[PDB]
Coordinates of C-alpha atoms and ligand atoms in Angstrom, one line a residue:
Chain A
X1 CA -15.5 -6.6 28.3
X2 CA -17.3 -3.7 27.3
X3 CA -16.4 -0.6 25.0
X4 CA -16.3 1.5 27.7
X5 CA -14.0 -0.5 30.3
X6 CA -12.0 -1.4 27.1
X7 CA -11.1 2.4 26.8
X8 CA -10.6 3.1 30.5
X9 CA -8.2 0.0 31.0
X10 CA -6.4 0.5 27.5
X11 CA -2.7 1.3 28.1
X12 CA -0.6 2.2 25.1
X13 CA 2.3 2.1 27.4
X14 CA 2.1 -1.7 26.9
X15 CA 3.4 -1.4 23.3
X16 CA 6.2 -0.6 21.5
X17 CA 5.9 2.8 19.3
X18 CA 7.5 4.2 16.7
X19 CA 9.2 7.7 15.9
X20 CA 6.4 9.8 14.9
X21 CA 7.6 13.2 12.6
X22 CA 6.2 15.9 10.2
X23 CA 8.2 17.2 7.7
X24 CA 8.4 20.3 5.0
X25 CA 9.7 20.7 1.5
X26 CA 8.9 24.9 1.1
X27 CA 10.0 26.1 -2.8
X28 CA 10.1 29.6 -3.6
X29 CA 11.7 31.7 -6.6
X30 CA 13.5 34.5 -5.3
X31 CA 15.8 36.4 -7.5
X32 CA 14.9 34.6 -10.4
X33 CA 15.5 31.6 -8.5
X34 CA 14.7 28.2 -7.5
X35 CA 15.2 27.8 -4.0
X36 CA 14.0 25.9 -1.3
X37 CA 13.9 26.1 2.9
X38 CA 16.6 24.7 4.7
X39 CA 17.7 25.0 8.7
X40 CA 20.6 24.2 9.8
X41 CA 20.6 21.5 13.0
X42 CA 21.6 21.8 16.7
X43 CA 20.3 18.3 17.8
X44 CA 21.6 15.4 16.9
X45 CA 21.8 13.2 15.2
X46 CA 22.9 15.1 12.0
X47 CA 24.6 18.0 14.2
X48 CA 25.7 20.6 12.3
X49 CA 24.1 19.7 9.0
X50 CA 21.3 21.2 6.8
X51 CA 18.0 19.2 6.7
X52 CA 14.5 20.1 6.1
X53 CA 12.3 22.2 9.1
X54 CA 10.3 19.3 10.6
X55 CA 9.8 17.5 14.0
X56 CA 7.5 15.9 16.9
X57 CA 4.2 16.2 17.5
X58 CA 3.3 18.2 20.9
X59 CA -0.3 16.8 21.7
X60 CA 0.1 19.8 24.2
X61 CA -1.4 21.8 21.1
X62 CA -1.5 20.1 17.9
X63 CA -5.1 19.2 17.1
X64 CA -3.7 17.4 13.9
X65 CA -0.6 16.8 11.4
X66 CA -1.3 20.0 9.4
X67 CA -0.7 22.1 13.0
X68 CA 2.3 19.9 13.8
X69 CA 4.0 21.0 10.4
X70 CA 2.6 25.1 10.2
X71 CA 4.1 24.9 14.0
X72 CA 7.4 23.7 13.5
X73 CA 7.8 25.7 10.1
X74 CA 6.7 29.0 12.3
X75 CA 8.9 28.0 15.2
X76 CA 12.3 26.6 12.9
X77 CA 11.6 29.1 10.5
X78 CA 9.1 32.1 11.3
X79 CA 7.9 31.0 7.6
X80 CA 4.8 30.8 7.4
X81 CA 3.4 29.3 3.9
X82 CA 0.0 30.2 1.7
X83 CA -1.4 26.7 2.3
X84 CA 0.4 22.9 2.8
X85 CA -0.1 19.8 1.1
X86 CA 0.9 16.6 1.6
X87 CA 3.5 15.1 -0.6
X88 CA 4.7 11.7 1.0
X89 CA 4.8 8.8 4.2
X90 CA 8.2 7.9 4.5
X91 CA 8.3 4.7 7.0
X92 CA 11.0 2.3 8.1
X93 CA 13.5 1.4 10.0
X94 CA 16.3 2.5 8.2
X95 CA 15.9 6.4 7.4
X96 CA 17.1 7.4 11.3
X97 CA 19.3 5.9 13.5
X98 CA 17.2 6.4 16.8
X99 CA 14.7 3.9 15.4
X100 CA 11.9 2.8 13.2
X101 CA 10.6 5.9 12.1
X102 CA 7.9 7.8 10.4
X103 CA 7.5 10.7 8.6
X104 CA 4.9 12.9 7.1
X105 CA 6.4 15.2 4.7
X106 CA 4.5 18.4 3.4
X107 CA 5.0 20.8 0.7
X108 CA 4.3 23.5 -0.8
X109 CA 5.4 26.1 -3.8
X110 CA 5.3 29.9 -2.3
X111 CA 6.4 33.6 -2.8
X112 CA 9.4 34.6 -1.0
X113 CA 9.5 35.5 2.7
X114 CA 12.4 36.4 4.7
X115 CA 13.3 33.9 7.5
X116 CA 14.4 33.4 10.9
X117 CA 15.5 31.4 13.1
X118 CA 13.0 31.0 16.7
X119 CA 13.9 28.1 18.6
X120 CA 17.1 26.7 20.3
X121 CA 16.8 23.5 18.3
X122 CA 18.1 25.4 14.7
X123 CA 20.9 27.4 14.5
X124 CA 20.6 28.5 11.2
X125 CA 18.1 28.9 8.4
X126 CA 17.8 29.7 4.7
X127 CA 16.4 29.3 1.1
X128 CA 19.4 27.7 -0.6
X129 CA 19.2 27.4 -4.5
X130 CA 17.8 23.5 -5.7
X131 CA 21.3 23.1 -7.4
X132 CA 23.5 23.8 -4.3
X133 CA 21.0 21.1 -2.3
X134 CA 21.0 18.2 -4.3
X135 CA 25.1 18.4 -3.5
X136 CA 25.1 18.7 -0.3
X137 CA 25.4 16.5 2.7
X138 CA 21.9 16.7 4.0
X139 CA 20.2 14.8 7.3
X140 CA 18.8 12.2 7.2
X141 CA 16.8 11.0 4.1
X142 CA 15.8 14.7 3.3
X143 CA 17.7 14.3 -0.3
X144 CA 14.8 12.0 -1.4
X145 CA 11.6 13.7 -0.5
X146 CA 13.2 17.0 -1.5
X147 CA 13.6 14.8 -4.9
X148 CA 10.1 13.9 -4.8
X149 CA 8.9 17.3 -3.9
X150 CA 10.5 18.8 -7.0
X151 CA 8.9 15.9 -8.8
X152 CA 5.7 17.4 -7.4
X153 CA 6.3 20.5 -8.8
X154 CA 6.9 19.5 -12.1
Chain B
X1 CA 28.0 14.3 23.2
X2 CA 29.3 12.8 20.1
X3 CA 26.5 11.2 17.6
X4 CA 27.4 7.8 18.3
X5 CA 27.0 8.8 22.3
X6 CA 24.2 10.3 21.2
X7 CA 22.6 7.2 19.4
X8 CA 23.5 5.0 22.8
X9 CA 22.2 6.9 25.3
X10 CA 18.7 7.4 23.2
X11 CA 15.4 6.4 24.9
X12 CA 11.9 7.0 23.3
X13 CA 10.5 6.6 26.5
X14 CA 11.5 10.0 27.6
X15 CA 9.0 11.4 25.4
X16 CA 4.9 11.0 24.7
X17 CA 4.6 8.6 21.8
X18 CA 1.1 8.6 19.5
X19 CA -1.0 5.4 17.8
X20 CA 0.6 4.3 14.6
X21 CA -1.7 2.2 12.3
X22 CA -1.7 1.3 8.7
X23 CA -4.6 1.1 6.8
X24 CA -5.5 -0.1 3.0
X25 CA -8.8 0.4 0.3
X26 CA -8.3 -2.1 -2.2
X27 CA -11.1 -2.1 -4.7
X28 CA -12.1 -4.5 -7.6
X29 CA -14.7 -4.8 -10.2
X30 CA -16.5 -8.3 -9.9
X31 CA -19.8 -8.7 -10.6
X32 CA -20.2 -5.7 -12.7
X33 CA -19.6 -3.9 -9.4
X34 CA -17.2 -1.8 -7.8
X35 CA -16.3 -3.2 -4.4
X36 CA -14.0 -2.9 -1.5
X37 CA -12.3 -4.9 0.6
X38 CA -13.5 -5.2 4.4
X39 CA -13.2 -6.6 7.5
X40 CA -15.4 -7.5 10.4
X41 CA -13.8 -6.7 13.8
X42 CA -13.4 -9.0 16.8
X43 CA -11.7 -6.0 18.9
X44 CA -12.6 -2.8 20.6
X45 CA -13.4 -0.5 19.4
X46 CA -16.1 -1.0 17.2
X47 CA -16.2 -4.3 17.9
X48 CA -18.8 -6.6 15.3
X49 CA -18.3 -3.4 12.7
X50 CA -16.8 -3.4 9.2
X51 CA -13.9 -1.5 8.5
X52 CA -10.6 -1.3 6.5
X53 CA -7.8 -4.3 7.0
X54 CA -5.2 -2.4 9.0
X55 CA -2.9 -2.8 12.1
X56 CA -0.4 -2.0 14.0
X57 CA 3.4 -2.2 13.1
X58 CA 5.4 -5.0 13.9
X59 CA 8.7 -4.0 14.3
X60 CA 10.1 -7.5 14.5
X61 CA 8.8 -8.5 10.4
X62 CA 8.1 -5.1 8.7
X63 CA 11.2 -3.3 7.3
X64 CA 9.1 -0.7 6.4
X65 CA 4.8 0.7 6.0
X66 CA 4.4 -1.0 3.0
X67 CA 5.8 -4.5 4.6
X68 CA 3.5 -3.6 7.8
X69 CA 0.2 -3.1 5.0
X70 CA 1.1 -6.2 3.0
X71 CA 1.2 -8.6 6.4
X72 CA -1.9 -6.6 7.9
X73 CA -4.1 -8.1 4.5
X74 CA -2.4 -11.4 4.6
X75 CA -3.2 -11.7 7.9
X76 CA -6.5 -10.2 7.7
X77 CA -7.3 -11.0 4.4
X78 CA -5.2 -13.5 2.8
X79 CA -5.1 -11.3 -0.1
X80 CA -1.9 -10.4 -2.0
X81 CA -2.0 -7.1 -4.1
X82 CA -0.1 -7.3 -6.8
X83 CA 0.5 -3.6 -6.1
X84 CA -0.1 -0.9 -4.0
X85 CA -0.4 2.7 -3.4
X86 CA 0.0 5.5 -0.5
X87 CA -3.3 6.9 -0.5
X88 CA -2.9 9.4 2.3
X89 CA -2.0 10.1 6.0
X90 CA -4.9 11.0 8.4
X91 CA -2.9 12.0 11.6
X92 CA -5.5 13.9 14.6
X93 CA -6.7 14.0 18.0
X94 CA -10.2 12.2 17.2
X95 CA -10.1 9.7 14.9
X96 CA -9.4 6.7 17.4
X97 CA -10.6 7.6 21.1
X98 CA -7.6 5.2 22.0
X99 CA -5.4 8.6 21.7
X100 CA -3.6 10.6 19.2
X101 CA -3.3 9.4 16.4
X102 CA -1.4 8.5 12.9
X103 CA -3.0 6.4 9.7
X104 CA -0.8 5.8 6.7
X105 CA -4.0 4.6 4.3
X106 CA -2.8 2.7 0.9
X107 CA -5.0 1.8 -2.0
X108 CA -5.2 -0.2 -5.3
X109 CA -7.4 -1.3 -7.8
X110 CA -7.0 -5.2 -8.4
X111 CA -8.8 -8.0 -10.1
X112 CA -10.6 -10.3 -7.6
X113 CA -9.0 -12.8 -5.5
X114 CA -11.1 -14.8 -2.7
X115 CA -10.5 -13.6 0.6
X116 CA -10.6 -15.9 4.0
X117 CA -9.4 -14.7 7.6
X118 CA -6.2 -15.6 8.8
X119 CA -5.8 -14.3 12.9
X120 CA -8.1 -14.1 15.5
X121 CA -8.4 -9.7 15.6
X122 CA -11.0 -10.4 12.9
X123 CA -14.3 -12.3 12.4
X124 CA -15.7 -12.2 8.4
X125 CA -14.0 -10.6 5.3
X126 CA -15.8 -9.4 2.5
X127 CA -15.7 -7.8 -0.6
X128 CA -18.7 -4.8 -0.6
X129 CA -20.3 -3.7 -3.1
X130 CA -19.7 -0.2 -2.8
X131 CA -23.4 1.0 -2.5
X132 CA -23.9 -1.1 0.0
X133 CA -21.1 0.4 1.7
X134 CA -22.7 3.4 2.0
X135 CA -25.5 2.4 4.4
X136 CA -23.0 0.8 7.0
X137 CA -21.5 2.3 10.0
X138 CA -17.8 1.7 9.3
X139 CA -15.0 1.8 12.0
X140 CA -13.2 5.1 12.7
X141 CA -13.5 7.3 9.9
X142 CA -12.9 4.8 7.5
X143 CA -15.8 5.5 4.8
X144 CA -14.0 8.8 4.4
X145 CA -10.9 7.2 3.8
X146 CA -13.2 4.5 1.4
X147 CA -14.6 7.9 -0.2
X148 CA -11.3 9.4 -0.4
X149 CA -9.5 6.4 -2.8
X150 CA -13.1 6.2 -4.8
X151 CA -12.9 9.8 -5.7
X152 CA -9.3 9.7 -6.6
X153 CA -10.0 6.4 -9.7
X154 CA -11.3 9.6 -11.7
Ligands
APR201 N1 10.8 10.4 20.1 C1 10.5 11.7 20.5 N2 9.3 12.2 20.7 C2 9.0 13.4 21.1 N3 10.0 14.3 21.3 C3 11.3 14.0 21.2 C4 11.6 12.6 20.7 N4 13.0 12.6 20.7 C5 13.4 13.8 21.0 N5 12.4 14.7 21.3 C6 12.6 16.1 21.7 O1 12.7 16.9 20.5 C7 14.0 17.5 20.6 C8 14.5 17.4 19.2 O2 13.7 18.3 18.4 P1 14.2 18.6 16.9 O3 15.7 18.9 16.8 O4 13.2 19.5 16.3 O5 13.9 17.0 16.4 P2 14.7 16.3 15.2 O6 16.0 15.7 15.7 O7 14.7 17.4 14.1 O8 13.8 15.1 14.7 C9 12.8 15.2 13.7 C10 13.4 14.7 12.4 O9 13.6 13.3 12.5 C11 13.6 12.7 11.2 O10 13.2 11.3 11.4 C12 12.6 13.5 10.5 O11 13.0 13.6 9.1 C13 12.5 14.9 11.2 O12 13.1 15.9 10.4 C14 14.9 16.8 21.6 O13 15.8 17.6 22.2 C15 13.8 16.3 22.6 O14 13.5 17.3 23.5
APR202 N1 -0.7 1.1 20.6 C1 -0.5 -0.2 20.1 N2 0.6 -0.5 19.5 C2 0.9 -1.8 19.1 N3 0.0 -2.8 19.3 C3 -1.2 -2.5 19.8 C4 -1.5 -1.2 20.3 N4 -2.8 -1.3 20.9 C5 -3.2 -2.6 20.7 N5 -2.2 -3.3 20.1 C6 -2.2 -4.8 19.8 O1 -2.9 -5.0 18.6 C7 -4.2 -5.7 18.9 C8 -5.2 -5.0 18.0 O2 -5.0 -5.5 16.7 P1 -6.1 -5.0 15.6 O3 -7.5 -5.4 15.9 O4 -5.4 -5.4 14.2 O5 -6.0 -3.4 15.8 P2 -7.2 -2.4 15.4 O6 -8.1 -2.1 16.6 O7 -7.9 -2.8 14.2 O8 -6.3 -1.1 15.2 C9 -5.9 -0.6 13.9 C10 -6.9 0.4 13.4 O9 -6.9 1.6 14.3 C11 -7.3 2.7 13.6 O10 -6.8 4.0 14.1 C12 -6.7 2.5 12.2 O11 -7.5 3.1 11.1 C13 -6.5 1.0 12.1 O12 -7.5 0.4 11.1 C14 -4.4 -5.4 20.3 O13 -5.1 -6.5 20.9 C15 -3.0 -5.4 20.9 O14 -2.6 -6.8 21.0

């Protein structure tokens, strides 16, 4: 078999995938103050709680990772940050219900900007103050990698 | 819909999933010389090409990446790290012309342990000099990944 009938025959189809998600850890001080991005969900699992802005990649548009995360930040959050780095791969089959799972978190440490909500999938968004975070009840694993994104910072 | 409704009536095959690989550069110093770990392919694409030990996930063994990394090197490989380190993720629309696509690429320096193939997806392992490296078409964008982990042992 050639290369070429390799890649017109291939079928991913065939195979078993994986959950496949971006992720964003966005500090700012405002007022004085540490806080960091939050939006509140309207999917489930994890209705009703606070997590971090992330999500699924739409090959419709996304040419890579970095446009997956600026797009679901712009679209959860109308937050656009200065630049994004990535912080952590968090993969197994533990962290969300609907399956083995991965997910790309990014973050970065910017000036204030005033958010809003811009999709039906949020119903709610806001920089909440690191202190009030680390006790709240938070989706998913989005405790730790905000943990290790203020471990980034430091 | 309740979350545990929610949770049962899930199916991933509602929705476009994207190639999920692992990857890993694990470098030693043996013979006065830096080299790298590869692997000579017996699959498309790039078949007869060095590249990086990686693989797919096996949901069935792997609890997590790092499981999926550790297995794809045994398998590959038959070495053992006694460590090892997220490098970075590499996650775009032209890395692997099998579709979009997600690398989660580890790394670690290591003393020398003898290598020997262990499944049939590869031909030869080798540990490269790193110069030598350099004048070798590599699979995907793997030299950049090679490059990437080199750059980062300063
Ligand atoms: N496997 C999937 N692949 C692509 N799209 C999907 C998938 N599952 C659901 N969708 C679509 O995405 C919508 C959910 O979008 P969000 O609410 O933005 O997704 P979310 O539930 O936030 O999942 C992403 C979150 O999962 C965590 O593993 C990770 O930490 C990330 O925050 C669903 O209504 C559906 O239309
Ligand atoms: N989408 C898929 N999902 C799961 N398994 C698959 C898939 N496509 C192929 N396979 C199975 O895995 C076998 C290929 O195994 P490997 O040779 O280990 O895979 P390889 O071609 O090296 O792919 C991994 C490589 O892809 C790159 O994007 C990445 O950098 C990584 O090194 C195939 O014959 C098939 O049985």
């Amino acid at each position: 078999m050639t290369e070429a009938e390799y890649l017109a025959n291939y079928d991913p189809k065939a195979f078993k995938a994986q959950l496949l998600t971006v992720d964003a850890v966005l500090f700012t001080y405002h007022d004085q103050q540490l806080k960091v991005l939050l939006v509140q969900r309207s999917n489930h699992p994890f209705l009703g709680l606070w997590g971090l802005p992330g999500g699924f990649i739409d090959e419709t548009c996304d040419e890579s990772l970095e446009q997956t995360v600026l797009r679901k930040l712009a679209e959860k959050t109308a937050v656009v940050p200065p630049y994004i780095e990535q912080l952590c791969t968090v993969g197994n089959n533990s962290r969300d219900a609907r399956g083995w799972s991965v997910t790309v978190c990014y973050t970065a440490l910017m000036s204030y900007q005033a958010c809003q909500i811009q999709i039906a999938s949020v119903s709610d968004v806001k920089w909440w103050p690191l202190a009030d975070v680390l006790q709240m009840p938070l989706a998913f694993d989005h405790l730790q990698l905000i943990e290790q994104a203020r471990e980034r910072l430091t």
